[PDB]
Amino acid sequence: ILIPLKEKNYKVFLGELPEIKLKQKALIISDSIVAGLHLPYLLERLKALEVRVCVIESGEKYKNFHSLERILNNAFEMQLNRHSLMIALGGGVISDMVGFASSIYFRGIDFINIPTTLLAQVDASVGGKTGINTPYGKNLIGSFHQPKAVYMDLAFLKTLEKREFQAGVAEIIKMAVCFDKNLVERLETKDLKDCLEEVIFQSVNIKAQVVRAGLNYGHTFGHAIEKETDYERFLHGEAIAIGMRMANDLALSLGMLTLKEYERIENLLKKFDLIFHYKFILPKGVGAFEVASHIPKETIIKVLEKWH
Amino acid sequence: ILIPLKEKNYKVFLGELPEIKLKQKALIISDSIVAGLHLPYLLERLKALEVRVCVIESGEKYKNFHSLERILNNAFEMQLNRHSLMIALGGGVISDMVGFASSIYFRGIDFINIPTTLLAQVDASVGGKTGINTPYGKNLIGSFHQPKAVYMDLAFLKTLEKREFQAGVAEIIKMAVCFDKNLVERLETKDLKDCLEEVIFQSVNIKAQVVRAGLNYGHTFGHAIEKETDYERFLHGEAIAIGMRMANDLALSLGMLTLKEYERIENLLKKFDLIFHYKFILPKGVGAFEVASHIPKETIIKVLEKWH
Numbered sequence: 050i051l052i053p054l055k056e057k058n059y060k061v062f063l064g065e066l067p068e069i070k071l072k073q074k075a076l077i078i079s080d081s082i083v084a085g086l087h088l089p090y091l092l093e094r095l096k097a098l099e100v101r102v103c104v105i106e107s108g109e110k111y112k113n114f115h116s117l118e119r120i121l122n123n124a125f126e127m128q129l130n131r132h133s134l135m136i137a138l139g140g141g142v143i144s145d146m147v148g149f150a151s152s153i154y155f156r157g158i159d160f161i162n163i164p165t166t167l168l169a170q171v172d173a174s175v176g177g178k179t180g181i182n183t184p185y186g187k188n189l190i191g192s193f194h195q196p197k198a199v200y201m202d203l204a205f206l207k208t209l210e211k212r213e214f215q216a217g218v219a220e221i222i223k224m225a226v227c228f229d230k231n232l233v234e235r236l237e238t239k240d241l242k243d244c245l246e247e248v249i250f251q252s253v254n255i256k257a258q259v260v261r262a263g264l265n266y267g268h269t270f271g272h273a274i275e276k277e278t279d280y281e282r283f284l285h286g287e288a289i290a291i292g293m294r295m296a297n298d299l300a301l302s303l304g305m306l307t308l309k310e311y312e313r314i315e316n317l318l319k320k321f322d323l324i325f326h327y328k329f330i331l332p333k334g335v336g337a338f339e340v341a342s343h344i345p346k347e348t349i350i351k352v353l354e355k356w357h
Numbered sequence: 358i359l360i361p362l363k364e365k366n367y368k369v370f371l372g373e374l375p376e377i378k379l380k381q382k383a384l385i386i387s388d389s390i391v392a393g394l395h396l397p398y399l400l401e402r403l404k405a406l407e408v409r410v411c412v413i414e415s416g417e418k419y420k421n422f423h424s425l426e427r428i429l430n431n432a433f434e435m436q437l438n439r440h441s442l443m444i445a446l447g448g449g450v451i452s453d454m455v456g457f458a459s460s461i462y463f464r465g466i467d468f469i470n471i472p473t474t475l476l477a478q479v480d481a482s483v484g485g486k487t488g489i490n491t492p493y494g495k496n497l498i499g500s501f502h503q504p505k506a507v508y509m510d511l512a513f514l515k516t517l518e519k520r521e522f523q524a525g526v527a528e529i530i531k532m533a534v535c536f537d538k539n540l541v542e543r544l545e546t547k548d549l550k551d552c553l554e555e556v557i558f559q560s561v562n563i564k565a566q567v568v569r570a571g572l573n574y575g576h577t578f579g580h581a582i583e584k585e586t587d588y589e590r591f592l593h594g595e596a597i598a599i600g601m602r603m604a605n606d607l608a609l610s611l612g613m614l615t616l617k618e619y620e621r622i623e624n625l626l627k628k629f630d631l632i633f634h635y636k637f638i639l640p641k642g643v644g645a646f647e648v649a650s651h652i653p654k655e656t657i658i659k660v661l662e663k664w665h
């Protein structure tokens with residue numbers, strides 16, 4: 050069991066989920082898929098005054114006020130107070146909704162994150178950045194609310210679909226190319242099946258030191274791909290995978306990355322089978338990044354002439 | 358203008374509203390009554406990049422999600438970001454809605470509270486407590502959001518009704534009897550119209566020095582009166598006025614208040630027309646309070662039945 054610390058709360062827990070002892074009532078919030086796979090795993094180890102379950106339907110489209118209201122109403126129905134706890138058993142969609150629901154319920158109550166997806170373990174459960182989607186855009190209504198404790202177990206990752214798993218892997222490389230050169234070297238040489246525990250541990254420490262601009266590597270182009278397709282074609286991690294390549298073309302054109310650096314990142318994406326032919330944040334090196342702003346339109350078009 | 362400092366965050370500005378020059382876009386939120394009385398007063402001395410007004414209907418029944426959604430949507434319509442500002446021009450209902458809307462919009466933006474009611478100038482302004490009402494109860498969904506600046510002008514208080522003004526005095530006496538002996542003696546010997554500024558200044562200081570139990574003096578009984586009457590007959594200050602007297606009956610029976618001290622508070626409420634006939638936290642003399650939790654039911658029932 051590995052315990053990464055932050056500033057100056059709280060405590061992340063890598064490894065098997067331990068026996069959680071609580072002296073107050075707890076509300077578990079999960080999705081339709083996770084509740085039929087990993088809810089027996091949590092309720093086997095949970096001890097509290099009263100435990101009730103609220104289930105949101107699986108999907109990004111359910112990340113709204115309607116589901117947020119349901120989480121709040123379930124907390125009101127079992128009469129939760131200022132000493133109560135909310136438990137998030139799911140991906141980034143669940144953890145953001147529960148964290149925002151707990152922040153506004155009785156002006157702020159404790160909540161615990163137990164991420165199931167690879168992306169949520171390496172990014173979403175860390176930081177306290179919570180929110181919901183609105184008709185005006187994604188994640189524009191939210192709050193900064195830090196969880197009491199984060200529990201990361203590799204057992205939840207085994208039930209994930211390979212396409213959803215690889216989408217999380219593309220997000221790990223994204224953080225590696227901009228922050229940690231040592232994580233790149235691990236992904237280049239070592240097989241992920243043999244060092245999954247070591248990869249996440251390094252990925253969490255990146256986000257722990259972060260908690261910012263830099264995690265948006267391949268997001269400016271990746272957002273544009275999802276807005277043109279639309280969200281019917283690619284998963285978020287797949288769109289960033291193409292977005293990183295588009296960002297690498299702009300970084301090579303501006304003289305930020307060398308030809309060998311451009312190939313090195315693209316070879317690592319090829320190693321994990323993350324090349325997808327379709328159809329602002331750029332690296333200054335393998336393990337570093339720079340913020341580019343005032344870039345000529347013709348330089349962008351020259352990069353956009355690659356499609357790809 | 359006099360400038361009371363809280364601790365580090367923000368400054369109160371007690372007196373005539375000065376020129377507010379801003380380098381960011383601003384959204385003013387007011388109610389139907391205040392907008393037709395005091396909105397021009399603010400607009401003439403406000404300078405910003407863009408100024409738009411959102412008006413909610415006057416009343417306690419409009420303190421909900423429906424009005425909160427409108428405040429957020431108006432901010433989205435004029436394209437407000439994390440640098441933008443919200444302006445609250447109204448009573449405690451407006452300030453709580455705007456403060457909660459600003460706390461969730463782009464995960465937290467700056468907001469300036471300009472209270473118009475006497476209640477909001479002495480209680481709702483300083484604290485950071487924001488929120489809205491739900492079908493499950495009042496002020497159960499909210500957040501702790503500190504304002505950028507508070508502006509208290511006595512010019513807004515002149516348009517208030519007699520009933521609304523005297524109900525705001527009930528909270529001043531509440532804070533005086535439990536914290537400041539000198540403020541009790543000021544209210545007893547001086548006319549309020551002669552030292553209204555000095556009374557507010559001391560009321561802000563008490564609220565500032567506390568920030569907590571003790572501000573709920575007459576709230577335990579006052580909530581029971583409001584729930585029995587279905588929030589129909591009395592205002593919040595009027596129900597607390599009876600609640601303070603009910604608390605005075607329990608404090609007199611325990612020996613916490615002398616008969617002379619008991620009559621002093623009753624005559625103070627009589628001076629501000631706060632006697633309304635019947636049909637935890639009690640004052641320890643004048644200027645002090647005590648938390649009583651283990652009071653026998655027989656004593657509480659003897660306080661009921663309307664004597665003393």
Ligand SMILES: NC(=O)c1ccc[n+]([C@@H]2O[C@H](COP(=O)([O-])OP(=O)(O)OC[C@H]3O[C@@H](n4cnc5c(N)ncnc54)[C@H](O)[C@@H]3O)[C@@H](O)[C@H]2O)c1
Pocket residue numbers: 080082083086087107108109112139140141142143145165166168169172173174175176177178179188205206208209210213285
């Ligand atoms: N700062 C932050 O907190 C931050 C950072 C990154 C992402 N996010 C947010 O997180 C969201 C993305 O999260 P995500 O990638 O987890 O998507 P997701 O939560 O929607 O999960 C993807 C799908 O996988 C399924 N799933 C989850 N766990 C499973 C399990 N263990 N076994 C089988 N299937 C499982 C879910 O049903 C879901 O439909 C985005 O909406 C984004 O806004 C927030």
Ligand SMILES: NC(=O)c1ccc[n+]([C@@H]2O[C@H](COP(=O)([O-])OP(=O)(O)OC[C@H]3O[C@@H](n4cnc5c(N)ncnc54)[C@H](O)[C@@H]3O)[C@@H](O)[C@H]2O)c1
Pocket residue numbers: 388390391394395415416417420447448449450451453473474476477480481482484485486487496513514516517518521593
């Ligand atoms: N901790 C806190 O922030 C805190 C403290 C006290 C009260 N509150 C909240 O505030 C609410 C009570 O506030 P309130 O007493 O101001 O009620 P209110 O905001 O509804 O104001 C009373 C009425 O007077 C009118 N009015 C306001 N300003 C006026 C003006 N200058 N001239 C003429 N009319 C005017 C309004 O239209 C309103 O209908 C409660 O619902 C409570 O939840 C919060």
Ligand SMILES: [Zn+2]
Pocket residue numbers: none
């Ligand atoms: Zn992301």
Ligand SMILES: [Zn+2]
Pocket residue numbers: 593
């Ligand atoms: Zn009130």
